[PDB]
């Protein structure tokens, strides 16, 4: 995974990390074409802990290789440290949405949702718990592809969940009950929140649960209440969003039977 910094363009800054500013940039591979590449820098990284905590990401990173999941490309470990992935071109998918709301077809919103489910189905084979799906975690390579990756402090820390809960900032309104109640996570509770960010794809970035207080959120599920079915969507779309909220995780659906359902809708939608 080494590369060599030579054949790295660096470009301007797209953003700002935990451990330095984040690029984009062009790498010229010696084995493969020319690829568009966001760039990881690391200030402080001549530190064996700091270099150890950054690093962390391509470590996790490296294990999957699959068409809707953000590509780690490589490794930069001489100072100063980089961490090379593909560059996703349009950027946030809430923002892309939300600019896109009157030019989008529901067959492109649809696609997404089964372009997810394909990378969520992978990472359910692999039996990795993402914890996170939500739309704010889903980056757009071009107008009919998706890319499932991951971002915030919490991911290097130690403890996690601990750190959002310090600044309020668990993701209440995305988590299944029993992550909520007990702080368990399971392909089951994924399947929760991809519910959540189908929903979100829906409403084209609108955030689910908007001016309700979290406290309230909880009383709500338990309750029985769910998100309303979105304008436009398909009612065998909002019937499989209803199933990944069964409040009992044993009755919510696998990725695999997601990925042949919303295949069935997309086909259905597009004829
Ligand atoms: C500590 C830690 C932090 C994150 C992860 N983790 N886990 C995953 C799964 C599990 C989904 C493989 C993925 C990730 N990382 C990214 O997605 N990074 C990541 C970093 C930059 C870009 N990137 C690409 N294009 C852009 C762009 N236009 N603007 C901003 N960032 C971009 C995309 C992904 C793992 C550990």
């Avoid at 990881?40 to 490296?62: G, H, I, P, Y």
């Avoid at 090379?84 to 946030?92: D, F, H, P, Q, R």
């Avoid at 892309?96 to 089964?114: E, G, M, N, P, W």
């Avoid at 499989?240 to 939608?269: G, V």
């Amino acid at each position: 995974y080494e590369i060599q910094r030579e054949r790295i363009e660096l470009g301007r800054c797209i953003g700002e990390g935990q451990f330095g500013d984040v690029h984009q940039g062009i790498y010229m591979s010696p084995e493969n074409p020319a690829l568009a590449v966001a760039i990881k820098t690391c200030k402080n990284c001549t530190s064996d802990s700091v270099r150890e905590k950054f690093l962390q990401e391509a470590l996790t990173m490296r294990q999957f290789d699959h068409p809707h999941i953000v590509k780690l490309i490589g490794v930069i470990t001489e100072n100063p440290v980089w961490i090379i992935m593909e560059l996703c071109t349009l950027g946030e998918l809430r923002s892309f949405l939300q600019v896109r709301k009157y030019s989008l077809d529901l067959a492109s919103l649809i696609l997404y949702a089964y372009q997810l489910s394909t990378a969520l189905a992978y990472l359910e084979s692999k039996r990795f718990v993402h914890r996170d799906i939500a739309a704010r975690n889903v980056l757009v390579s071009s107008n009919d592809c998706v890319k499932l990756g991951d971002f915030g402090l919490s991911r290097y820390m130690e403890d996690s969940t601990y750190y959002k809960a310090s600044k309020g900032k668990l993701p209440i309104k995305w988590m299944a009950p029993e992550s909520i109640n007990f702080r368990r996570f399971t392909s089951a509770s994924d399947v929760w929140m991809f519910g959540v960010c189908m929903w979100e794809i829906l409403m084209h970035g609108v955030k689910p649960f908007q001016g309700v207080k979290n406290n309230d959120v909880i009383g709500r599920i338990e309750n029985g209440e769910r998100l309303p079915m979105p304008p436009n969507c398909p009612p065998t779309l909002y019937s499989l969003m209803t199933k990944c909220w069964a409040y009992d995780p044993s009755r919510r659906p696998r990725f695999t039977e997601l990925k042949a359902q919303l295949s069935t809708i997309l086909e259905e939608e597009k004829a």
